[PDB]
Amino acid sequence: ERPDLAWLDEVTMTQLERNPYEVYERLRAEAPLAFVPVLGSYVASTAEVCREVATSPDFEAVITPAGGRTFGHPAIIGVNGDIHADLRSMVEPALQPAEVDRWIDDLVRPIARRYLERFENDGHAELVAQYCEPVSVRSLGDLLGLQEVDSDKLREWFAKLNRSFTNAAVDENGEFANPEGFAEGDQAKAEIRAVVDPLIDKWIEHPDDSAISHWLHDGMPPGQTRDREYIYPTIYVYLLGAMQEPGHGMASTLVGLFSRPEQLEEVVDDPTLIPRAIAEGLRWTSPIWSAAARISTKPVTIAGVDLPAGTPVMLSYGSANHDTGKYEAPSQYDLHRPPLPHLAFGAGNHACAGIYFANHVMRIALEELFEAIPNLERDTREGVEFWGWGFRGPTSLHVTWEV
Numbered sequence: 397e398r399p400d401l402a403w404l405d406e407v408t409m410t411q412l413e414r415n416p417y418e419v420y421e422r423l424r425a426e427a428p429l430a431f432v433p434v435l436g437s438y439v440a441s442t443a444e445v446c447r448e449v450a451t452s453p454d455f456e457a458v459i460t461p462a463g464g465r466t467f468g469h470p471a472i473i474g475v476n477g478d479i480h481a482d483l484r485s486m487v488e489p490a491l492q493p494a495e496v497d498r499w500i501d502d503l504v505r506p507i508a509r510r511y512l513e514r515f516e517n518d519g520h521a522e523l524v525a526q527y528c529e530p531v532s533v534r535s536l537g538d539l540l541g542l543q544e545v546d547s548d549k550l551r552e553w554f555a556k557l558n559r560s561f562t563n564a565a566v567d568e569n570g571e572f573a574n575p576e577g578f579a580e581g582d583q584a585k586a587e588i589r590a591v592v593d594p595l596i597d598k599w600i601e602h603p604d605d606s607a608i609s610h611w612l613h614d615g616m617p618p619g620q621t622r623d624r625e626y627i628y629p630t631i632y633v634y635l636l637g638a639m640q641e642p643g644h645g646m647a648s649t650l651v652g653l654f655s656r657p658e659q660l661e662e663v664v665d666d667p668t669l670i671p672r673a674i675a676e677g678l679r680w681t682s683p684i685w686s687a688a689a690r691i692s693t694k695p696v697t698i699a700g701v702d703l704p705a706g707t708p709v710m711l712s713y714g715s716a717n718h719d720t721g722k723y724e725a726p727s728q729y730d731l732h733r734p735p736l737p738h739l740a741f742g743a744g745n746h747a748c749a750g751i752y753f754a755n756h757v758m759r760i761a762l763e764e765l766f767e768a769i770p771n772l773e774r775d776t777r778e779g780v781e782f783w784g785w786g787f788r789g790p791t792s793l794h795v796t797w798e799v
């Protein structure tokens with residue numbers, strides 16, 4: 397429909413998943429808000445357009461079509477009004493900074509040590525599967541009340557929900573081009589129900605200090621609980637992004653540091669620099685790269701485009717965090733970049749609710765790793781591939797150390 401962008405017709409889902417950067421570099425220059433045919437949606441590629449859409453009074457929350465097919469209703473990321481207010485009040489207590497500070501160290505640090513103890517003397521490791529992912533899911537899983545769900549299973553669930561949620565390709569008629577791509581999402585949800593339904597049964601009659609027990613009971617009249625069908629979509633929100641992204645953030649940070657060996661040494665020498673390294677890592681490869689969206693509630697003009705009411709816009713925060721109007725050489729990792737606002741946690745009233753928790757999980761994990769293996773080296777016999785358009789991170793991170 398937009399003639400000068402006819403090249404967008406030839407962009408593929410696989411290309412966006414393998415490497416979205418060239419297409420989005422072109423988008424940021426030619427059309428900060430652009431309809432991408434294979435995604436079937438407008439996409440916002442620049443920091444200005446992403447932040448405007450995420451905070452605009454003329455936009456409200458929505459899930460991308462494949463995300464809605466995966467999570468259903470009411471997922472906290474895609475609802476508004478009183479429902480959203482209730483779901484926010486539901487998840488917020490255990491994420492409050494003063495509360496996190498009470499227990500985050502006794503939570504994450506023994507978990508990090510346990511996973512490190514399995515390989516820290518091996519001299520070689522694949523840190524995504526052996527460390528970054530297990531620490532992320534074990535920390536959150538224990539907080540939720542899923543202590544007895546093995547980290548292998550939690551990692552499998554977030555991988556299947558990832559692929560279902562991002563099964564976004566549409567054909568010439570706007571229909572999903574890969575309809576069998578949702579089946580492993582459906583299978584993951586079926587497995588989650590068989591595991592979590594008996595836990596919910598128990599928590600209803602015998603509440604405890606797990607987060608999910610508090611989702612059932614907090615703020616309810618005496619003897620009442622939130623119906624499980626009302627909270628499961630937000631459980632799924634957690635079992636995808638909240639489980640996956642701290643691991644993505646850690647690993648992308650390590651990859652960025654390895655690309656600046658002078659800066660990796662600095663951080664290992666002075667671990668007070670770990671929060672700064674993580675912040676740049678999230679800017680450099682944003683874990684929730686283009687999974688979020690908003691929908692317009694009235695006619696609105698964005699980046700010169702007159703959008704009718706009811707128009708979805710995908711928020712490609714990962715591209716926004718490479719906006720060359722904001723950063724110098726944003727494709728390069730630079731620990732010493734001046735700290736600026738970034739959009740890796742989103743913006744607006746649907747901005748990330750778990751920032752403080754997530755940053756601590758990533759910080760403690762990297763502190764323990766560098767203490768256990770100060771001579772960590774990237775295994776340059778293998779290259780690092782990143783995968784994902786909706787959610788993005790390294791598929792593996794092979795490392796060595798002397799020893």
Ligand code: HEM
Pocket residue numbers: 450472473474484487536634637638639641642645678682683684688689713739740741742743744745746747748749750751753754755
């Ligand atoms: C580095 C790790 C993480 C990153 C980069 C991240 C990023 C994001 C992003 C981009 C969104 C959508 C924001 C928007 O649409 O504008 C989001 C939403 C959310 N995240 Fe985080 N997230 C991370 C970890 C976590 C963790 C560990 C939790 C929970 C313990 C969590 C809880 C939530 C919740 C509840 C929402 C929904 C907020 C709402 O819709 O009102 N996140 N996150």
Ligand SMILES: COc1ccccc1O
Pocket residue numbers: 473632633634635636637638684687688
């Ligand atoms: C925090 O988890 C998510 C955020 C945005 C989209 C999907 C998620 O699971």
